[PDB]
Structures are given as C-alpha cells and as structure tokens.
C-alpha cells in the first residue's frame, strides 16, 4: 500500500521562517511527483503522535534547534518511523564543532589549526599565558563557541576581550586560525556529490541578509573540483551521514580546502543553495525531493 | 509539590532482565531518600506521555537500545522533561566504536592500535590482502562490529581473520580489528565530576575493589577516565572501561552511558567504596538532572 508522508516544518527555533518556506516547497515537490504528503508545522502538532496520526514515513524540513540537531531523529526512531536525512548521531554530532574537528583530524582530513578552550583553563589563566598558547597559530583570528556570538581578532589586545563574550552561551570554545577564502558548498545526495557553489558574504562571516552573492558555477578549474568533491563526501562519511546534507568548506591563501561543518537539514527554499546546486546537476525541484525520500530507508 | 519522578526501567532490548533489577533497586533508594518516585516499565507505558501523566523528571534506568543511545534522550529533550545522565549526542556518540576512537586519538588519549573496515573495502579485498591491512598489528587480534559481545571474536592465527570478518560484517557495515591486550580490566565510575574508586574485573569472575594499584597509578587512571569522559561530552554519571597492556599502559576501551544499577553491578560497589550508600548514589545522581 501507498505511503503517507508527513513534511515536518515550522518548528520553535531561530529557523522558523525559512523552515515555513523550506516545508511548503518541499511539500509542492512531493505531490507533484504524486507523493501523499502532508505537512505539519511542528509548532502546534506534536511530534510525538505522527504515528498515531497515520504517517508512515517523515520528510525533514526543520532547521536548526529540536530539527537537525539529533532530537528529533531520536524521538523518530522511538516510534520507528523511517525518515529523511542523517541518523541520530550524525545529526547531533554535526551541531557540536569541537568533535567534529577531531573526527576529522584523527582521520587526516584538513581542518584550520585551532585550539580549544574550556572554562577552567580559561579562568586558571592570564593573557600573557593565554597569547603565547595561540601565538602558533599566527594572525588574525576567530574565536568562537564549540555549540552566533563569535568575533575576527587582529592582534594580541583584542584576544581577551573577545574570550570572553564567547563564554556567555558556551563552555568549550575554539580559536581558529583565520583563513583567506572563498568559501564553497557541496551538495550530497545519497551517494551523489552535485556541483559545488562559491558563496561571498559582505562581511567576514557567513553567518546567520538578502546581499550574499553565489556563484554557480564556482569558478574552479576542473582539477579543483574533483578535489572538493572527493574530500566532500569524506566529510560527510566521516560523521557517518547519510541520506543527502551540505559540506561547508574554505579555501586558505595557499588554494588548499579546509573543512568547516557539515549541515545535516539544508533549506529548502526556491532560493536555498542544494536546490541551486540541484537544477546544475541538471535535476527538478521535484525529482530533488523524490530522491531524499527514495533515500529513507 | 514535590516533584514526582519516573524511575524507567524494563524496556524491550536484550537488557530488560537487568533493566527491572537496576530500577528496582533504584526506586527503592529514591524513596529511602525521601523522594517522590514511581517505577514506569516502559513495555507497558510509552514515554511519549510522561508529561501528561504528571511527572517532573526521569531517572533512566533502561539499558541498550532505547535507553542508552540517545532515542531516549531525544524524547525527553523534546518533552523537556530533566533527565538522569548523558545527553543526545554523547549517548548516541559512545555506542559508535569507531568514532569514540576518533575523537580520543585526536586529544592524544591512549586507544589499542586498530585498523577499521567497511563493507566496501570487505568486497573489494582478498583475504590475503586483508590479512596484510592488520598484519603492523600483530596476534591476537579482537573483531568486533563497530556499532554497540555479539559479533565479536579473538582471532589467533591470520588464517581465523576471514571467518571472524564475515561473523561481524552480519551485524554492521563498519569493522574494528584490535591488538589484544594481556590486562587486566578497569572501570571507572563517574559522578557528576567526582570520579568514584576504580574496580579490578579478572574475568575467566572475581571483583576487586580496591583496585590494587598504586596510589600514584589510581591518579592517573582518575584523570584519565575524567578526560575520557569529557571528551565524548558525557555528564551526569556514566561507567569508564579501561585495559592494562603488559608493562601497565592504561588504554581506553568504551563509556558506558546508562550503567546497571542492581546489587551485583559495578556503579554501586564503586559507591560502596566511596562512603556512600546506594540510597546516596541515586539520590545524587538524580540531583545531577536539571
Ligand atoms: N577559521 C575561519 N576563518 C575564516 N572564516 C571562518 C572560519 N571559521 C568560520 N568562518 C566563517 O564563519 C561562517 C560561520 O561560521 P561557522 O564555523 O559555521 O560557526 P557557526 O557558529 O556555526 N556560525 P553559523 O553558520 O551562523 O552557524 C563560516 O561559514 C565562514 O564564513
Ligand atoms: N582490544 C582488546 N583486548 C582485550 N580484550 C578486549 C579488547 N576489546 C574488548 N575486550 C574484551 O571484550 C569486552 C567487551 O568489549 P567492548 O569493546 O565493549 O565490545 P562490545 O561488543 O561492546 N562487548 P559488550 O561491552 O559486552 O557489549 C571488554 O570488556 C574486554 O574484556
Ligand atoms: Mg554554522
Ligand atoms: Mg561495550
Ligand atoms: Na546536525
Ligand atoms: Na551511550
Ligand atoms: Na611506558
């Protein structure tokens, strides 16, 4: 018999809104291609009861916070309920930086040289200790939280200062070498690397708008891609993810590619990046989302 | 008010037996403890409904799949109900071998040398060529599938390695083999930050408490533990599993993140060593959930 598919959007978090637009494409896509689809904004219907409410298999478009952070995969396989996107683990793992660097550098893949900080070590210490435990890693810098509130540092004064703002919504930090750009994005869909997609932002961070600029094409030569692709999809092994996800990756002054963060639930909208990098790749809205679901398994 | 607790216990993984004796016991020390607590078999009660049936806060005392490994955790968060132990991502973390390794390796934290293997490279590969791919590891080997002894072997010969692959690639698609370790075994348990006093495991099995170690080793393997616990971003409580080598080498073998709390169990005799009562341990435990 036919499955009924629920399209989970909306939600509680930050992400609410591009979680509004992300859902109602996916669930335009989904009927298109003759799918039973259902949506259902999380805000008001809970969770807990897509079993009872005669579902039979769960398509993400949540964003941030209680969507890809392994929550609601949790709450998913309790009621055994197959879905799209990475498993419990891949999803919480991607959220927490720190240990995705580690995953990655015990596996050799590259990643900027960091340090990281708690706040014991940070609080049984001065800025004169502090200096010299960063100063192998050169300037300028970005201090930010391990799990938004994070800052560019030019020289030894500005450190401490920015220490501290970090601490107000973490406890484990990372200080980062800074790293020149561009900043590029590769798609993967169950197996597939798509085309990646340069991104320049008007300021130093790609952070939480309507300027930013992207390029697709990227504007890579040939043997630059291949390079990104094959190193894409090592990441996102790496954290064990599957169904489909984005790799986030910088270049460095010296052209090498370092690794930043995987996204296990990617927007959605018409003017998302995996739908552009998508319609490259020569696929339909449409055919995009049939596939995420064939890959639920 | 006071705030009324669900002790979950029970379940339907292999551990249910263990699981009813460990919320048993736990039950009866909330209570001795002045707390207000009600045993839920959670064959019988969803989970889904805590809240709506009244309850403030959950003692896990589940053990395996659905109690340990996060599934669990992520019903409670979006319940938002405070909970005993690890959260999502440390549960779910420490059940993955493979990546606990990982994430050890890169802190500089001492593991076995191991060699992993996938379905992929399985198919791909002679048993010749196998063989060669865990050869810098020497004899013994240990197999085991990378997902929490089920699949796992002690191979001593190379020519054993095949038939102890195919028994593990069964229940995974991910493979560790491991340099044997001549022992003995160690666990360390865990309380919010105080690490309680280590226990000697000489299985075939005798329970040693004290440990015997020097002072001076118990520190180190204290600190250790501590570290091994923080790397993988446990909290709570939490059971750490560690080896010896031949010349006294601590290496790090698992954390385990929902430990058994019955009268035989490992948690509570660390407590017992420690000056406290079980009544004390699971009162403390649960004053650990905010
Ligand atoms: N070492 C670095 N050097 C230069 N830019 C960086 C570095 N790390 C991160 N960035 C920029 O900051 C952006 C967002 O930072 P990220 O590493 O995702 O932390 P975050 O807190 O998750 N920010 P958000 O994307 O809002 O979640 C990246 O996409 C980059 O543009
Ligand atoms: N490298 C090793 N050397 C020697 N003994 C080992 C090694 N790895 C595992 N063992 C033994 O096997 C036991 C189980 O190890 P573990 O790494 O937890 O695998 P497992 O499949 O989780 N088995 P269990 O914990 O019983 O589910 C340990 O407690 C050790 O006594
Ligand atoms: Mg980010
Ligand atoms: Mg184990
Ligand atoms: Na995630
Ligand atoms: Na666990
Ligand atoms: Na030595």
Request: aromatic residues 8%; hydrophobic residues 40%.
């Amino acid at each position: 018999m036919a499955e009924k598919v629920a399209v989970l959007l909306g939600g509680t978090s930050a992400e609410r809104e591009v979680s509004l637009l992300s859902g109602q494409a996916v669930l335009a896509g989904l009927k298109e291609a003759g799918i039973d689809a259902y949506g259902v904004d999380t805000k008001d219907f809970p969770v807990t009861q897509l079993k009872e409410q005669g579902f039979d298999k769960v398509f993400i478009a949540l964003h941030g916070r209680g969507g890809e952070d392994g929550t609601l995969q949790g709450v998913l396989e309790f009621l055994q309920l197959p879905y799209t996107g990475s498993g419990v683990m891949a999803s919480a793992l991607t959220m927490d930086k720190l240990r995705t660097k580690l995953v990655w550098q015990a596996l050799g893949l590259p990643i900027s040289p960091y340090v990281a900080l708690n706040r014991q070590q940070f609080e049984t210490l001065s800025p004169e200790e502090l200096v010299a435990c960063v100063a192998k890693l050169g300037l300028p810098l970005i201090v930010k939280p391990s799990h938004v509130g994070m800052s560019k540092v030019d020289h030894a004064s500005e450190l401490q200062k920015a220490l501290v703002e970090a601490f107000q919504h973490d406890s484990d930090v990372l200080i980062e070498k800074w790293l020149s750009g561009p900043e590029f994005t590769v798609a993967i869909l169950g197996d597939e690397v798509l085309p990646s997609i340069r991104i320049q932002p008007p300021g130093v961070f790609y952070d939480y708008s309507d300027k930013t600029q992207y390029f697709c094409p990227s504007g890579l030569s040939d043997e630059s891609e291949q390079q990104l692709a094959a190193l894409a999809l090592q990441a996102y092994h790496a954290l064990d993810c599957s169904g489909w996800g984005r790799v986030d990756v910088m270049q460095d002054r010296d052209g090498h590619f370092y690794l930043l963060e995987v996204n296990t639930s990617p927007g959605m909208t018409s003017h998302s990046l995996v739908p552009m990098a998508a319609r490259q790749y020569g696929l339909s809205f449409s055919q995009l989302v049939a596939r995420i679901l064939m890959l639920a398994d």
